Amino acid sequence: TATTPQTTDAPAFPSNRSCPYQLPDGYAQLRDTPGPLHRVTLYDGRQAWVVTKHEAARKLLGDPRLSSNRTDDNFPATSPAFEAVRESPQAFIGLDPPEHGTRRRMTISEFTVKRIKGMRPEVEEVVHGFLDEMLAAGPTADLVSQFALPVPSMVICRLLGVPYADHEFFQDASKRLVQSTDAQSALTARNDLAGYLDGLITQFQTEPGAGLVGALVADQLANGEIDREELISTAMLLLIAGHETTASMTSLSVITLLDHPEQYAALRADRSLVPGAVEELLRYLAIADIAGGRVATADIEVEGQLIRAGEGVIVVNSIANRDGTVYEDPDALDIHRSARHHLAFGFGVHQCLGQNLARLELEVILNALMDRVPTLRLAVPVEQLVLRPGTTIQGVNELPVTWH
Numbered sequence: 001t002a003t004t005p006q007t008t009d010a011p012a013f014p015s016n017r018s019c020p021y022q023l024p025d026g027y028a029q030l031r032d033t034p035g036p037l038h039r040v041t042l043y044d045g046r047q048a049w050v051v052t053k054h055e056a057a058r059k060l061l062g063d064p065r066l067s068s069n070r071t072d073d074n075f076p077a078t079s080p081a082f083e084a085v086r087e088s089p090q091a092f093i094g095l096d097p098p099e100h101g102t103r104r105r106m107t108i109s110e111f112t113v114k115r116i117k118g119m120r121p122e123v124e125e126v127v128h129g130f131l132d133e134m135l136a137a138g139p140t141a142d143l144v145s146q147f148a149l150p151v152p153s154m155v156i157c158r159l160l161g162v163p164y165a166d167h168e169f170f171q172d173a174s175k176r177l178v179q180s181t182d183a184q185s186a187l188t189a190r191n192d193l194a195g196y197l198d199g200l201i202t203q204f205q206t207e208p209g210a211g212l213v214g215a216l217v218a219d220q221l222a223n224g225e226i227d228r229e230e231l232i233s234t235a236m237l238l239l240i241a242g243h244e245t246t247a248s249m250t251s252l253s254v255i256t257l258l259d260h261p262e263q264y265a266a267l268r269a270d271r272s273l274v275p276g277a278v279e280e281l282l283r284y285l286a287i288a289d290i291a292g293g294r295v296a297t298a299d300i301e302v303e304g305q306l307i308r309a310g311e312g313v314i315v316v317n318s319i320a321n322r323d324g325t326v327y328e329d330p331d332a333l334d335i336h337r338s339a340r341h342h343l344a345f346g347f348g349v350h351q352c353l354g355q356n357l358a359r360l361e362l363e364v365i366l367n368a369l370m371d372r373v374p375t376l377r378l379a380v381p382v383e384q385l386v387l388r389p390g391t392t393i394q395g396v397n398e399l400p401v402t403w404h
C-alpha cells in the first residue's frame with residue numbers, strides 16, 4: 001500500500017472553509033507560496049492551475065486566451081455536478097467575445113446605476129417587509145429562510161418578471177442546482193427550472209408582460225436574435241445568481257460582524273461607513289471564490305511559468321483578495337480600509353452584472369438590521385454552524401438568531 005510521505009505539489013482543490021470568514025488552511029498555504037500560479041488536483045485526478053495573486057488574477061481574467069467556455073473538454077470541472085453544465089446550453093457567463101457581448105447587452109438595461117437607484121424604495125420595502133414579519137413573530141428564527149433568501153428572491157423575481165407566487169418551487173430548484181454534488185441531481189434541478197421558465201415564455205408570447213423575461217420575449221426572441229433555449233439559460237442564470245449570492249453575503253456578513261463587535265459598533269454609530277463596510281465584507285467573504293474557471297485556447301506565459309493551450313485555470317478570488325501586497329494585513333477585517341480593486345465580483349468582460357444591485361441590497365439590509373434589530377445575535381455558537389463545501393457558493397444553509 002501507500003507507505004511513503006504523502007506530500008504533494010498539486011494539492012486537492014477546492015478545500016472547505018472551517019471558519020466562515022477565513023481562508024481554508026490549504027488556501028492560506030497557496031496564498032503564501034510565491035508566484036502567480038499553482039498546480040492543483042481536481043476531484044477526478046486531472047491537474048489544473050489556480051491563480052493565487054491579485055495582479056496576476058486581473059491580468060488572466062482580462063486575457064482573451066483564457067476562454068469561459070464550460071462546454072470545452074478541458075474546462076476545469078470542480079465536482080461531478082459540473083457535468084450538467086458541460087452538457088446543457090450556455091448563458092453568457094459561458095460565452096467569449098463577440099457572442100458574450102451580444103447576449104450580455106440584452107440584459108444590461110435592468111442593472112444600470114439609474115435603474116438601481118430607482119429600485120431603492122422597492123428594496124427597502126421588501127427588506128422591512130420581511131423584518132416586520134420575522135420580528136412580529138418573535139425569536140428564535142432561522143435568518144436564512146426567514147430573511148436572507150426571500151429578500152433577494154423577491155427583488156430578482158420582480159426584475160425578471162417571474163411570479164413570486166412560485167417561490168417555493170424555484171428557490172428549492174435553485175438550491176438543488178447550485179448545491180448539487182452529482183450530475184443527475186444537477187440535471188434534474190436544471191430541467192425543473194427550464195420547464196418552468198419555458199412555460200413562462202409562451203405565456204408572455206400570448207400576453208406581453210413586465211420584467212426582463214417579458215422584454216426579451218417581446219423583442220429579441222420575436223426578432224430571432226436569441227434562441228428560446230438561450231433565453232431560458234439566461235433567465236436561469238439571473239434567477240439563480242440573484243437568489244443565492246446576496247443571500248449568502250447576508251448570512252455570512254451577520255456572522256462575521258457579530259464576531260467583530262468593535263467594528264459592528266462603529267458601523268452602527270456612523271452609517272456613512274456602510275458602503276465601505278460592504279466592500280470590505282465582499283473582499284473578505286469572497287463567496288463566489290471558484291467562479292473563475294477558464295480554459296486556455298493558446299499558450300500563455302505568466303511571469304516565467306507556462307499555461308499551455310488546453311489546460312484548466314481557476315482564478316480563485318478569495319485567495320487573490322488576501323494578497324498582502326494590495327491589502328495591508330489582508331486577513332484582518334477592517335471596515336475602514338480601502339477595499340478598492342477587490343476581485344469578489346471578478347474583473348474584465350465577465351465582471352458581475354449584478355454587482356451594483358448586490359451593493360444596494362447589502363447596504364439596505366445592514367442598515368435595516370442595525371435600525372430594527374440592534375440586539376440581534378446568534379442563537380447558537382459559531383462552531384456549531386454547518387458551512388457549505390468549497391465546491392459551491394460559500395455560506396450556511398441555516399442561521400439561528402435571537403434578539404429583544
Ligand code: HEM
Nearest residue numbers: 092093238241242245246288344345346350352353354358
Ligand atoms: C452578492 C454577491 C455577488 C457576488 C460575490 C458575485 C460574484 C460574481 C463573480 C465572481 C462573477 C464572475 C464570473 C466569471 O468571471 O466567470 C459574477 C458574474 C455574474 N454575476 Fe454576480 N455576484 C454577486 C451578485 C450577483 C447578483 C445579485 C446578480 C443578479 C443577477 C448577479 C449576476 C451575475 C451575472 C449575470 C454574471 C455573469 C456576467 C458575465 O458573464 O458577463 N451577481 N458574479
Ligand SMILES: C=C1/C(=C\C=C2/CCC[C@]3(C)[C@@H]([C@H](C)/C=C/[C@H](C)C(C)(C)O)CC[C@@H]23)C[C@@H](O)C[C@@H]1O
Nearest residue numbers: 078081088089091178233237240290292293392393
Ligand atoms: C445556473 C446555470 C446552470 C447551472 C449552474 C450550476 C450547476 C453546477 C455548479 C455551478 C456551476 C456552481 C459552482 C459554484 C460553480 C463552479 C465553477 C463553474 C467552477 C469554475 C467549475 O468552479 C454555481 C452554479 C452551478 C445551468 C445553465 O444552463 C445556466 C446557468 O449557467
